[PDB]
Each structure stands twice: as structure tokens, then as C-alpha cells.
Design a binder for these strands. Structure first.
Ligand SMILES: [Mg+2]
Ligand SMILES: [Mg+2]
Ligand SMILES: [Mg+2]
Ligand SMILES: [Mg+2]
Ligand SMILES: [Mg+2]
Ligand SMILES: [Mg+2]
Ligand SMILES: [Mg+2]
Ligand SMILES: [Mg+2]
Ligand SMILES: [Mg+2]
Ligand SMILES: [Mg+2]
Ligand SMILES: [Mg+2]
Ligand SMILES: [Mg+2]
Ligand SMILES: [Mg+2]
Ligand SMILES: [Mg+2]
Ligand SMILES: [Mg+2]
Ligand SMILES: [Mg+2]
Ligand SMILES: [Mg+2]
Ligand SMILES: [Mg+2]
Ligand SMILES: [Mg+2]
Ligand SMILES: [Mg+2]
Ligand SMILES: [Mg+2]
Ligand SMILES: [Mg+2]
Ligand SMILES: [Mg+2]
Ligand SMILES: [Mg+2]
Ligand SMILES: [Mg+2]
Ligand SMILES: [Mg+2]
Ligand SMILES: [Mg+2]
Ligand SMILES: [Mg+2]
Ligand SMILES: [Mg+2]
Ligand SMILES: [Mg+2]
Ligand SMILES: [Mg+2]
Ligand SMILES: [Mg+2]
Ligand SMILES: [Mg+2]
Ligand SMILES: [Mg+2]
Ligand SMILES: [Mg+2]
Ligand SMILES: [Mg+2]
Ligand SMILES: [Mg+2]
Ligand SMILES: [Mg+2]
Ligand SMILES: [Mg+2]
Ligand SMILES: [Mg+2]
Ligand SMILES: [Mg+2]
Ligand SMILES: [Mg+2]
Ligand SMILES: [Mg+2]
Ligand SMILES: [Mg+2]
Ligand SMILES: [Mg+2]
Ligand SMILES: [Mg+2]
Ligand SMILES: [Mg+2]
Ligand SMILES: [Mg+2]
Ligand SMILES: [Zn+2]
Lengths: 83, 208, 104
RNA sequence: UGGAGAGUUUGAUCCUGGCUCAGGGUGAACGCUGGCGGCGUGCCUAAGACAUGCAAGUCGUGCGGGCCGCGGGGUUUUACUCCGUGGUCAGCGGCGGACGGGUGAGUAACGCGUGGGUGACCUACCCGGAAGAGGGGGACAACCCGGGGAAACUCGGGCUAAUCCCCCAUGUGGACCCGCCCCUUGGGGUGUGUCCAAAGGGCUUUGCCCGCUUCCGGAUGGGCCCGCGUCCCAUCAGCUAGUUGGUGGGGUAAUGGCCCACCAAGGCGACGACGGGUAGCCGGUCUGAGAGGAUGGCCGGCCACAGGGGCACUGAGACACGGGCCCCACUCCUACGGGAGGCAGCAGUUAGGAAUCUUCCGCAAUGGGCGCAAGCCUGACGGAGCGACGCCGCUUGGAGGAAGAAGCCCUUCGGGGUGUAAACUCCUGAACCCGGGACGAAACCCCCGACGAGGGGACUGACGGUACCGGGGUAAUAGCGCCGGCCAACUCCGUGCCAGCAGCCGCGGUAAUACGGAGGGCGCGAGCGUUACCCGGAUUCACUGGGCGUAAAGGGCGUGUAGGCGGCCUGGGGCGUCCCAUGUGAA
């Protein structure tokens, strides 16, 4: 199935991830279906997480499955906040 | 320094006062006065009609030595000033003049750029407050260049900012001798530099 | 869009099939001038309907054989053996180009 | 924000013309030299051969067991026998092993690029919707019993569970023949007939969780087809017999000579067929003023390959690198019968070579497989290690300091040079020492809420006592090339067409700025030179952008085939050409 997961993009000791949609079977850094966010785990800037809940919600609706820290990040942007 | 070695022997090769060694270059002892010919055995001989290349070479040396920069470092700036929008001649001179090691010597924290290099490598200098020990650091406008807090009263920066009492600072820099701060207001207008060097030639050298 | 080409039938010699000759002008990548250039398609003709010389539109289509991947869509201009003849001489020439000559 | 030229044919000249230099680039290697760090990068040759270790498994919440323990029962006691529980092992079964990882050998091809087509198709796991699980039956491992082989391993007999296999039922629905309607290639309806379903498990047990069945849709991935693009040789000119097309079969998820039988005689080529050579293709890279040229190395995408050659099984997917069979070549075992292998996974060894790294740490992060979960596996990966191999930052000090030591070097014998350089005065304080010491990590999980949203909690660091912060603090590596012109930089001695230099032009035949050394000078600087290769200067294959009376170049002349090209006026079409919109042009 298609996943929502992290793609490692920074540099040696400088991790930045792209939050991506992709078939589970790509390499982690290979061709992805759509970037739908980014994550800087060092919080080196004020702007260290970013999602696009609209698209995130889209891919969930067609059954993308997010990895365990992708969903954590998605939640942190209120992808799932329903109230 | 970066060259490290006989300095006033370059004074004599370029035939112009360069002021690399600070204040003795103001004394009647700088070799340029009362020994103005190149170094070496043949330095007092009838000097041959210098080639077109020779002249563009020397003017570049004339510029690069005045800033104490290497050459790989120098070329990397000119090329950045090439690719940059604007007049590539005096966009070069602005970058050169934005080097922290030079800006410190402009604010008269040190009598020369070489002495100003050492004060930077030895953490005697703040930029905006945090230490910066990289002489190549690029000062941007708005940035405030202090003497390091715990340095402020060394025997050297004492007697050097004492000379700067009443002395005048370039148009593009402020300066505050009390707390030993200084600001970079604007990249220099080509007119502001009294540089004994036709930088038009330096462009012409790097295009053979 | 299934590609549609227009051409000249230059062969009836087959069962339920026509050779269609398709030209295309275009400017030459380096030297500018407009170069003609042509290619023969084998087209599916199930009524053995179209005849030597007919000018037909030919359409992309699901394979009928090796070679045959086009069907004859409609008839544009009926009859004109000049093109056939033009094409015919071109292959007549071929005979010359070899290792001998004379009356050959 | 874009274009520099020079040296060399002559006694001199102008032109033609080649050669050479200056510039940029590099997975480099060689020489002399070598201090720190960050980030990259590192078998170009043998797709040669490979020791050793590790590299794909997981699930007891599908099933039944063996072995080793412990505990509780039925009896008055033993014997026998029943139940519970701990460890362990494989077996049956499910999902994964078709991904990830390696390489570029082959391949000039729908292989790749690009844009389309599929009324000619598939898609496990995932999401949405509709509906469903009622009876019954069977076998094979494990285990038990025997045989055979040295071994790898193998044969026979008997027992048994299941989410293993089958039969009947239910028919939402679907499949197939025929018909009918709408569509229009095999798209979507509809009727009769026929055919087709299912599996159980766990509980904080009646109602939840995880599964199972059929169908319809989505999503992702893929098959196949087509237009157009893709190197050199014409001293390769003709090629083809499953060849080209038809009918009907077979085969497949599906179109197709894909394969087969029969029939017709086609198909292809100078717009380069057939043959030979070479090569993985692209995003991109390098160079260039551009147009071009060159290239495909890191990373990303496609393809292909897994000692060489075939092949099919299983399956959603493979004709499968760490699966199966056969043939070939090697190495190993061998009781001579027969067996065991396959680093182009990570390291590592050897061989070839001018040359290419550690048998390192860790699953903390990201990602993948299985598992409800706890977790397990992961040489993917995250790090560390070696090499100046590249890039970038940084140091070997700063300020003062003589009319100006000493040595060395010139000298017109007065002087001049190295040279503020050193010595020396003061100042700072790379190395080193002490102390604090990270970010990367908040989820899974547990509690509250409702296993939702939301809130609370706990656990976790290979790198690493590193980064960085603070306190101390020592004047602490400089090399290499060059100095006739092109090309920045000249003097002495030695040498005598020798020894030697030499990119090109040219130096050396006793006063050599060209050889060798010295002093000095120039250029770069932890690097500088050399070789090799690429583009450049090279308008020196000229499209931009050249030529052919004598420099190289008009065919000995014609005829006229293909082809190229084509006077003036009107009209239609709108292929070329131009315009707008739009889609594509991933990272
Ligand atoms: Mg001549
Ligand atoms: Mg001459
Ligand atoms: Mg001349
Ligand atoms: Mg490294
Ligand atoms: Mg190799
Ligand atoms: Mg392991
Ligand atoms: Mg047991
Ligand atoms: Mg087991
Ligand atoms: Mg070929
Ligand atoms: Mg194509
Ligand atoms: Mg469903
Ligand atoms: Mg039996
Ligand atoms: Mg079953
Ligand atoms: Mg039935
Ligand atoms: Mg090859
Ligand atoms: Mg050019
Ligand atoms: Mg091999
Ligand atoms: Mg093989
Ligand atoms: Mg399967
Ligand atoms: Mg099958
Ligand atoms: Mg396999
Ligand atoms: Mg294969
Ligand atoms: Mg292997
Ligand atoms: Mg290896
Ligand atoms: Mg060797
Ligand atoms: Mg390595
Ligand atoms: Mg994980
Ligand atoms: Mg790694
Ligand atoms: Mg934190
Ligand atoms: Mg964990
Ligand atoms: Mg000169
Ligand atoms: Mg002599
Ligand atoms: Mg000499
Ligand atoms: Mg020379
Ligand atoms: Mg450096
Ligand atoms: Mg050219
Ligand atoms: Mg040439
Ligand atoms: Mg021309
Ligand atoms: Mg010419
Ligand atoms: Mg002649
Ligand atoms: Mg001639
Ligand atoms: Mg003539
Ligand atoms: Mg002639
Ligand atoms: Mg004609
Ligand atoms: Mg005309
Ligand atoms: Mg014409
Ligand atoms: Mg048109
Ligand atoms: Mg467009
Ligand atoms: Zn001076």
C-alpha cells in the first residue's frame, strides 16, 4: 500500500525530512508521489514543522498509511483534530 | 597574517605605499620613503617597458596584497562579484571591504589588517554580540562589531581605541569609542575607498 | 488521441491489408531547410475496400498483426496514381545501385 | 552581465596552412612536500577467483506435537492415568522471501527519452460501499516403526490437528453460452439456463478486537501498443520463408505469427534495409559568447544481469542474486558409487594494475518484513575509520625594531643585495591541561476519555564525554614550481655541440639571463609540479561561421533518373509558418 512517511534530506548530522506520500516499496529517499510537508527535528528555525492538512487528509481518505512518527507529526499539525 | 613574511618588500615591488604594517608605515622609517625601488639585487636598475600582462598582474597583486587575502580566496570573491548583478568592478571592492578582518581595521580596533586578523582569530571580537573568529566573515549592513567583552581592557586594545578618540571613521561606518562598539552602515560607495588601484585593470586580468 | 495519419495506398497485394505511404515535412534540426520524409504503414482493410491510389486517413489501433497496427479510417481523395507512380519509380531506381550496370 | 589572443615557413613582406602555448575541467595517478577541522568522495583494471563472519525473516491471538523441568488431581497406598504451568526444538499453516542491496556484462532495442493509447489488461497488503459464513467429509508432516547411503541425503509402514484440502447448501452478487436494448473493437444494461462463496482466532466474553467470503468502486504499482527522438563504417547494397498478410486454433491477466495448422505471395531497403564496429539510456555533468562539442562518474528514474547456457514450478507478482531442475567450466568432498559450492550484499583476501578504504559501532534516528501487541529481524540505514582525492574554513604569529649585525651574493673597490628580515622589546595564545556538557526524542506503550478527537505519564543516544560553553595556557610546520620569447621574474661561477635542457620556437662548439650550482627575483602555498584525458582558444567540418584561376579543392565532357529548386494574377483548403489558451516539463 501507499504510505505517508519521512524522507531523509538534510546532511550528515543535519537531518531534514520531507513528509511524503509513496508506495511503501520505494527506497526511503527515492521517487515519491507527492511532498505534503517537512520536518526539522532539531527545531533549528521557528518553522520546523509544516503539513497541509488538506492533502494529508486526502491521502488518508484513499488509504495511505502513515508511519509511526509521520502520524505523530501529522497529529501535531492537527490533521486529525475533528472538533 | 596569511602571507606571513617581509611586508615592506611588497611596498617596494608595487612602488606604492600599502600600509600593511600599521603605524611604522606612517613613520619616516617605512622603506617606501628613502628606498623606493623593488627588492633584490637588480632593484635599482633601468626598468624595462613592462608588458600589457605585467601591468594587469601588478594591479591585481597591488589590490590583493593590500587586503592580506590569499588568492584562492581573492579569485572566489571576484567571481562572486562577476556573477552578481551590478557593476562587477566596484561590487568586488565592496565584498573585500565587508570582510570582518578588514572592517575591524577600518574601525581602528587594530592599526593594520594583519593585526586585525589576529584579534579575530583570537576571539577578541564580537559581531552582534556573539564571538566571531573567522576573518573572512561577511559583515552585512546593520551588524554591530564590538571588542570582546572580556578583552575590552587588554594593553593593546586600550592604547588603540585611545588613538581612535577624536579620529574619524569612514562614511559607511559609525563608531562609539566608549563601549568600543562600531556599526557597518552601508557597503562602501566606490568613491569612499581611496584605493591606490585601478580595479578596472583587475577585472581585465581575470579574463585572459 | 489515437494518432491519425493521411496517406496513399501503394499496395493492394495483400489479403485484407493495404500499404499506406505517409509523408511529413519538417525543418531540419541543424541546417534549417524543410525536409520531406516518409514512412509506409500496413493498414487493416477488412472489406478489401480501399484501392491502389486512394488517399485515406489511417488511425492508431489495437494490434492486428506484426506490422499491422493501423486501421483505414476513411477515404479522403479517391484515385491518384501519380503518387503511386512517384513511389513506384523510387523503387525502380534501386535496380541500378549495385555492382554492375549496362542494360540492367 | 555576453566573444582578448600569442609563438612558429621569409633576408624582409602579405596570404594560405598546420603545429604549439595561455583558460576551464577530473572517481585520477606519479614526484617533492606535508599542520588542524567540516563536508563530500575513493577498483577507471579481472562481470577474475574467493578463506572467514554477518547479510530475510516473522507470527502461540491459525494448528498439533517431541524433549527437558515444576505443580495440582482421580486411589487406602503404589501402578496406571487426568489438568495446569516454565523453558526448548522443529513440523504443519499464514505473510514476507518479486522489496530493500550489488553490478553495468549483454543490449543500437519501444532498451531509453518524450507525448499518447488500452473497447486489449492485471494489481497482495491499503481505503470506501453492499452483502454473507448453514451442514458434512478428507489427507500429509510432526511423532511412532522399520530399511538404504560414506555423506548429501533418501525409501517404506502406521497415527493426527488446523485459518491445510474437498463435497452439499445459502446467490447480495458474479462468471459463461444465447437473445434483446443502449453504447461503439472486448464499454454498460437486461432475460432465461448453467456454474461459483467463506475460517476461524483473542478477550477487560452476547459483542468487542483480529481475521475469512463474494461483488462494486478508489488508491498504488505494473503489462502491452503507438508518433517522434537516440553513435561510427556504404572499403556492409541488397535483405527476408514464421518471412509478410489471411482464416481458424492454441496460449495469456491482455493485443499480437507469440505459437500452430491451412491458404494467399507478401514484407523491407539509397529518407541506408542486411551486415560490421562500439555502447546500458535519461535527469544531468564539463566546456563553450552562443550554436556546438564532450560525457553519463556521485545522487535520482528506467532497463538489464547474478560463474556461462537453457527451463519451468510456486505465486498478486519471478521465469526468482543469498528458491527448484538440466547442460558446460572451474574449486572442494569422495568409502570411486556419488555429492557440496557461486561476495557484481557488508566487511575482507588474492590476482591484474599507474591506482581505489575497516574483516569498525549501533539499531538511538529514518525506512522496510512479520506480529493485536510486547517485540523480533534489518552490513537498508544512521555513525565512526583509513587516503590532501576534491571542496570549504583555519594555523606556522601580531606591534616595535639599524642608515642597516653576521654569514652568503654581487662590485666600477666607493659600494650594492638578501633586509624590518633576523637578533631583540612588548603583546596575543594554535597545541595542550581542567571543568560543565548537548540537540538529534517523541512516538509506539500505559492511564483518563470511547481502543475516536483531546489530555496525562513513563521508556529510549551508536555518534559520545564528541559538538559546543567556561577556566588555564606555550611563539609554536614551508613547501613546490619557475626567471631566453610566448610568460610575471638576472647576476656570478662551473661546463665547451660535452654533460645536459627542451610545450613550440630553439639553448650548449670557452666571456651561456635557456645546461649544473649559487645569490637574488617571480608565481602559488598545505600544497605545488608532472603525466593522461575532455571542451576551449580552433570561423582548423564554418548552422551561427570557411573555401576550390595560381595556396588543399570544379567531376575530362555530356545526357539527363531520383531528388533539390521554381515567373505574374485570382479563389478555396490551412500541411509548413505564426498566435492565444491549456496540459506535461517529478525530485
Ligand atoms: Mg616556404
Ligand atoms: Mg629566419
Ligand atoms: Mg615576422
Ligand atoms: Mg572523511
Ligand atoms: Mg570495474
Ligand atoms: Mg547481525
Ligand atoms: Mg512444547
Ligand atoms: Mg516454531
Ligand atoms: Mg549492431
Ligand atoms: Mg515511446
Ligand atoms: Mg473493504
Ligand atoms: Mg503414510
Ligand atoms: Mg481455505
Ligand atoms: Mg455450491
Ligand atoms: Mg558494454
Ligand atoms: Mg566556438
Ligand atoms: Mg564473478
Ligand atoms: Mg544464469
Ligand atoms: Mg502471494
Ligand atoms: Mg500460477
Ligand atoms: Mg530469491
Ligand atoms: Mg531476471
Ligand atoms: Mg551471495
Ligand atoms: Mg565486498
Ligand atoms: Mg601488482
Ligand atoms: Mg567507505
Ligand atoms: Mg522501525
Ligand atoms: Mg552508510
Ligand atoms: Mg526534547
Ligand atoms: Mg521501540
Ligand atoms: Mg619577462
Ligand atoms: Mg661562463
Ligand atoms: Mg642560468
Ligand atoms: Mg627557460
Ligand atoms: Mg585550504
Ligand atoms: Mg569548433
Ligand atoms: Mg584540424
Ligand atoms: Mg557556412
Ligand atoms: Mg579555409
Ligand atoms: Mg602547383
Ligand atoms: Mg591546386
Ligand atoms: Mg572543366
Ligand atoms: Mg583533374
Ligand atoms: Mg526533375
Ligand atoms: Mg511561387
Ligand atoms: Mg516542386
Ligand atoms: Mg497549420
Ligand atoms: Mg508549454
Ligand atoms: Zn610599509
Amino acid at each position: 500500500m501507499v504510505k505517508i512517511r519521512l524522507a531523509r534530506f538534510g546532511s550528515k548530522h543535519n537531518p531534514h525530512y520531507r513528509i511524503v506520500v509513496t508506495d511503501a516499496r520505494r527506497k526511503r529517499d527515492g521517487k515519491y508521489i507527492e511532498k505534503i510537508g517537512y520536518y526539522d527535528p532539531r527545531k533549528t528555525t521557528p518553522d520546523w514543522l509544516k503539513v497541509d492538512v488538506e492533502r494529508a487528509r486526502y491521502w488518508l481518505s484513499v488509504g495511505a498509511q502513515p508511519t509511526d512518527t509521520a502520524r505523530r507529526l501529522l497529529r501535531q499539525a492537527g490533521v486529525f483534530r475533528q472538533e | 597574517g596569511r602571507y606571513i613574511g617581509p611586508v615592506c618588500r611588497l611596498c617596494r615591488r608595487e612602488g606604492v605605499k600599502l600600509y600593511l604594517k600599521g603605524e611604522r608605515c606612517y613613520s619616516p622609517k617605512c622603506a617606501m620613503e628613502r628606498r623606493p625601488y623593488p627588492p633584490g639585487q637588480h632593484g635599482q636598475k633601468r626598468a624595462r617597458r613592462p608588458s600589457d600582462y605585467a601591468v594587469r598582474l601588478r594591479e591585481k597583486q597591488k589590490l590583493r596584497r593590500i587586503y592580506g587575502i590569499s588568492e584562492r580566496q581573492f579569485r572566489n570573491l571576484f567571481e562572486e562579484a562577476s556573477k552578481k548583478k551590478g557593476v562587477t568592478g566596484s561590487v568586488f571592492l565592496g565584498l573585500l571591504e565587508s570582510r570582518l578582518d578588514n572592517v575591524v581595521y577600518r574601525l581602528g580596533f587594530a592599526v593594520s589588517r594583519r593585526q586585525a586578523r589576529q584579534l579575530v582569530r583570537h576571539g577578541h571580537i564580537t559581531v552582534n554580540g556573539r564571538r566571531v573568529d573567522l576573518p573572512s566573515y561577511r559583515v552585512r549592513p546593520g551588524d554591530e562589531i564590538a571588542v570582546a567583552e572580556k578583552s575590552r581592557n587588554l594593553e593593546l586594545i586600550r592604547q588603540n581605541l585611545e588613538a581612535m578618540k577624536g579620529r574619524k571613521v569612514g562614511p559607511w561606518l559609525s563608531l562609539d569609542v566608549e563601549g568600543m562598539k562600531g556599526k557597518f552602515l552601508r557597503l562602501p560607495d566606490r568613491e569612499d575607498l581611496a584605493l591606490p588601484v585601478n580595479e578596472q585593470l583587475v577585472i581585465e586580468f581575470y579574463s585572459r | 488521441p489515437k494518432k491519425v495519419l493521411t496517406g496513399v495506398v501503394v499496395s493492394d497485394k495483400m489479403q485484407k491489408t493495404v500499404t499506406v505511404l505517409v509523408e511529413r515535412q519538417f525543418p531540419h534540426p541543424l541546417y534549417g531547410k524543410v525536409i520531406k520524409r516518409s514512412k509506409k504503414y500496413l493498414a487493416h482493410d477488412p472489406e478489401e475496400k480501399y484501392k491502389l491510389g486512394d488517399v485515406v486517413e489511417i488511425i492508431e489501433s489495437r494490434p492486428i498483426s506484426k506490422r499491422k497496427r493501423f486501421r483505414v479510417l476513411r477515404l479522403v481523395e479517391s484515385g491518384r496514381m501519380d503518387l503511386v507512380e512517384k513511389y513506384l519509380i523510387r523503387r525502380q531506381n534501386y535496380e541500378s545501385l549495385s555492382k554492375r550496370g549496362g542494360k540492367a
